[PDB]
Design a binder for this molecule. Structure first.
Ligand SMILES: OC[C@H]1O[C@H](OC[C@H]2O[C@@H](O)[C@@H](O)[C@@H](O)[C@@H]2O)[C@@H](O)[C@@H](O)[C@@H]1O
Length: 426
């Protein structure tokens, strides 16, 4: 029992009626919305919620949050699903305590996943131990949004408090990666899947920002300060201060101060190091910097991205530097911007050349005030599905029957996000 079929069907009817002029949107929305709930979510022995990604049979801290986020609206009516989502926070925080450096986790201590190729400290709960700053943002974001959307507070238990302390500590240690206990080397010929310098990663200076090993694409950072994830960290560090103050949790005074101090330092770090200049001389955000003067000009479709900055709450969609960044990202000045017969959009080091991501099309829609652009991107999302009726990881710009990931629940849910945004559902 993860949700109430009766309440969810009624909410869907209400959505379908709001979107009645777009039957093509509705069919895709319902297929995607139903799939996540019936096929990716399960309640464990201990009453917590394990959420798998889809066609990779493991749980990402990133994916699992984005997967359940659109259910917050109906969770205001469906108290059972509200519990389910509180159980996901509970599972996430428990797994953070298991290993706060891992992106991905198993259903139990079973040693499924990548241990055989991977040289790092491991245990049987870990699917792979690729450290991505945003992996630790997402569970704090889910906890906060569950609280604000529904009023639920049961997720804020001793596990939550301990996991928050772990995150703050790890983020602090990673303000100077020289003190880090984390190393990762994978037996592979694909360099994006391992860390240079015998697992240490590329050179950097201290900036005040917090170091990451890998991106939310699961490919490794070129430079260690990944600006979108540090943007996300600043936001969720605000949530930490709100939750601890509103709820008088254990050690509130010390946690609020530690979180505030880290937030200020990461924010000062962004200010001092995160900006570069485009071909036209405009100030823009860099994607990755090292603090030694290198700064890449690009964006990757995975969230957190530069494109997603207003979506994650870091800045206003109206911000001048964001807008200049956006124009640079959605142009050939970005080496990952691809243009074909069916669509133009964002590819990734992680996917085949010429393949662009539905997640970034959705985010592009979510980060413009322009309703005609939202409607265009929705129509294109539906038209570039290879006749499947669901969202893929990536599809060829010249032929969307060429795609990756048959079953990618996170991407299905980002399509849902944009439809809800279009119908003014928030
Ligand atoms: O982002 C998911 C996943 O992407 C890469 O591996 C994809 C896929 O490769 C297969 O050969 C197999 O290893 C399967 O288990 C794996 O999911 C890679 O970057 C990986 O680290 C990452 O988890």
């Amino acid at each position: 029992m993860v949700y109430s079929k009766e309440i969810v069907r009624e909410w869907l009817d209400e959505v379908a009626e709001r979107a009645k002029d777009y039957p093509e949107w509705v069919d895709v929305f319902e297929r995607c919305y139903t799939d996540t709930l019936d096929n990716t979510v399960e309640i464990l022995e201990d009453g917590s919620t394990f959420v798998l990604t889809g066609d990779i049979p493991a749980m990402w801290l990133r994916d699992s949050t984005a997967q359940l986020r659109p259910y917050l609206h109906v969770a205001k009516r469906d108290a059972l699903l509200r519990q389910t989502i509180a159980g996901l926070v509970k599972r996430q925080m428990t797994l953070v305590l298991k290993d706060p450096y891992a992106n991905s986790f198993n259903i139990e201590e079973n040693w499924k996943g990548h241990h055989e190729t991977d040289h790092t400290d491991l245990n049987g709960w870990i699917w792979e131990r690729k450290y991505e700053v945003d992996s630790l943002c997402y569970p704090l974001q889910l906890a906060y949004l569950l609280w604000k959307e529904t009023g639920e507070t049961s997720q804020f238990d001793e596990i939550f408090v301990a996991a928050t302390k772990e995150i703050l500590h790890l983020w602090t240690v990673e303000q100077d990666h020289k003190n880090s206990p984390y190393r990762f080397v994978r037996d592979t010929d694909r360099k994006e899947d391992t860390l240079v310098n015998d697992g240490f990663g590329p050179d950097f200076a201290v900036t005040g920002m917090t170091w990451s090993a890998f991106r939310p694409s699961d490919d490794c950072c070129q430079y260690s300060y990944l600006i979108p994830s540090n943007m996300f960290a600043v936001v969720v560090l605000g949530y930490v201060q709100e939750i601890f103050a509103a709820l008088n949790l254990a050690d509130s005074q010390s946690v609020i101060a530690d979180a505030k101090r880290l937030q200020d330092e990461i924010q000062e770090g962004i200010k001092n190091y995160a900006y570069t200049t485009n071909s036209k001389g405009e100030k823009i955000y860099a994607f990755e910097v090292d603090g030694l003067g290198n700064a890449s000009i690009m964006d990757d479709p995975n969230v957190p991205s530069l494109l997603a900055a207003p979506y994650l709450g870091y800045c206003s969609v109206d911000d001048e530097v964001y807008q200049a960044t956006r124009r640079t990202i959605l142009s050939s000045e970005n080496p990952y911007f691809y243009q074909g017969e069916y669509a133009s959009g964002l590819g990734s080091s992680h996917t085949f050349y010429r393949y662009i991501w539905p997640i970034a099309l959705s985010i592009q829609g979510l980060t413009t005030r322009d309703k005609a652009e939202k409607k265009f991107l929705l129509d294109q999302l539906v038209a570039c599905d290879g006749g499947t009726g669901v969202m893929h990881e990536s599809f060829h710009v010249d032929d969307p029957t060429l795609y990756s990931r048959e079953w990618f629940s996170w991407a299905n849910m980002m399509f849902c996000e944009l439809v809800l945004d279009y119908l003014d559902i928030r």
